[PDB]
Amino acid sequence: MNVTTPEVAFREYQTNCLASYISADPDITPSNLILQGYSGTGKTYTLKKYFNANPNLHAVWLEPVELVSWKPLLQAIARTVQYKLKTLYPNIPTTDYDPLQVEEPFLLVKTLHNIFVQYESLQEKTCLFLILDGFDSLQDLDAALFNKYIKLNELLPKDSKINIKFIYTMLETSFLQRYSTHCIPTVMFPRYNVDEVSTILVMSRCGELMEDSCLRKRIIEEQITDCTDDQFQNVAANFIHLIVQAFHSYTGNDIFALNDLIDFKWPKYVSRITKENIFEPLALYKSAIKLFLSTDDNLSQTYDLSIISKYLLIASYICSYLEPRYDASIFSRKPRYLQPSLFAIERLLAIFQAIFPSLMKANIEVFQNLSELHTLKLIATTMNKNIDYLSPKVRWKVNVPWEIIKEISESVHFNISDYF
Amino acid sequence: NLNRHIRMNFETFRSLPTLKNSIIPLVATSKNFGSLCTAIKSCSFLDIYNKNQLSNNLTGRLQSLSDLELAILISAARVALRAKDGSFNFNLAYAEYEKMIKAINS
Amino acid sequence: ILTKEARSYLVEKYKELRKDDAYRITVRQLESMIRLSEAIARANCVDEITPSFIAEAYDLLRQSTVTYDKYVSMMNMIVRKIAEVDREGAEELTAVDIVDWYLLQKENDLGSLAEYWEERRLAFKVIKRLVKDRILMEIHKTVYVIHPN
């Protein structure tokens, strides 16, 4: 049979390329095929649309995102192929093999051969496609792993009816270039252009936002009798275009990031829709100026600390960025962008005593505040396992940036700016 | 025109299956003999295939970035250039961004 | 002679410069700004030191296809024209409205009737460049408003 081509916009080369490598004849389709495209390039959507356009094809869908490692990857292949073969040919009497016995790729080959032997009595050769979306997204991955999937078809009995025609999708490009010499038929996906992203989001989210409860509540509240779905779509498109033109430099030509801004700002934008803003998007934009001037992607006196805690933090920041050379020069009566350095506990205590406003000394409250600072992730250590503060090999460093310590000093009225 | 592609392919790399990997799309994409007679002669589709093969290298990724992304990239590259080790961090990139915007406004 | 409002404009612009050195500007540069404003007015018929002269002196000391200066000159004019109707609340401006206004602002600098179309076309190209830089936002007339940046 002849494959029918889908009408996916902004991909009208790859949808034609897929008709080249996928066909009803298993003697034509290659044993491997890789589709390459970064996140949000439409690979999964395009491939799923192509398969849904030609139901006569036979496929298995798995996601290494869910399948953490390679052993589940093989086990799911075996189990899903078994289920699919039962579903496609219930009439043929067949037996079962345990999909949980697959421990090595050879065992996968063995189980697949054993299953395919059962279906030897099939009338014609069958073309089967195994689809792994995001092959390089596997959490435990190595270079030698992918080679095991390229040269696997030829270990099967070549006279068998069931032929496995693997399909892979890849995100990165440093991954695919390692396998260039294999000359695997590869189809490519570039990043969508700004106009393409703008058109796609309008095509996608318009119907999603035309039927939300908030707008149809606000229409009732505002008694908009002349509101129509055509104008509803126009309002949604104006919203999307405004977000795109305001935040393309912030998000890039990325579909996922813009979708979430469209979701977040949508209630607040709706709150400003009134009787006067039905026909003038300019006035609505003017009313919504403060919504556009801020991304609002933020999750939201920034750090409530005791005076001892504040002075300890002030001293620690000096320790982590001032050379040990200058301690006696500055504090005894006798750089903004680099990563902080380590410091010892005695240096911190000495600088704290020197800067605390007759001696303050070190009581239990001082060390308690110091430990609170560590617990609050304001001071970092040089250890990650079996935390033991009293071990004489652990050093300290500051995790608080300049913008916060500036305001802390302002609240303390301590002039750090003159020490550098 | 077709022999032009053949010679260029030969002079670039001499693995025949690699050239077959490009010829096959041309044949499969062909819809009918009448259109095939026109398509096979000029053979403009191999250029499209070749550019697709290169669409995800450094140039293809650089062509799609926005103005802000490109400016931050330029600033980070400047920081790396002024660095003996060629390394940079976010703070230095943003400081160079601030300085370049101040200069542009000034 | 310094105008009364020029004093406020001068102290504001001096604070603006002093903020940027957090060489380093001293009060000698304030006296230099007064002196350069005096010199610029000295090359003119009016003793009134308008804020424009102090702005020119500020630019000359602080700064230490189409050509760069000619293009950048139109940007300030167009931005200020749009910010004017922003404060007034009047109707927003299209591209043609900006081009005609800008041509009216420079009637005396045009050289010939042929240069009219040249400057109109250059203004449209400059508008397109500004939109590409996202300093002007296009909304739907083809409405141009100050970009959120």
Ligand SMILES: Nc1ncnc2c1ncn2[C@@H]1O[C@H](COP(=O)(O)OP(=O)(O)OP(=O)(O)O)[C@@H](O)[C@H]1O
């Ligand atoms: N031409 C198009 N027309 C309509 N929608 C499109 C088009 N291209 C992409 N999209 C949308 O963009 C979304 C991007 O998600 P997609 O399924 O492509 O993820 P992915 O890139 O494969 O995933 P991952 O980054 O997690 O590996 C699709 O789900 C689809 O809704």
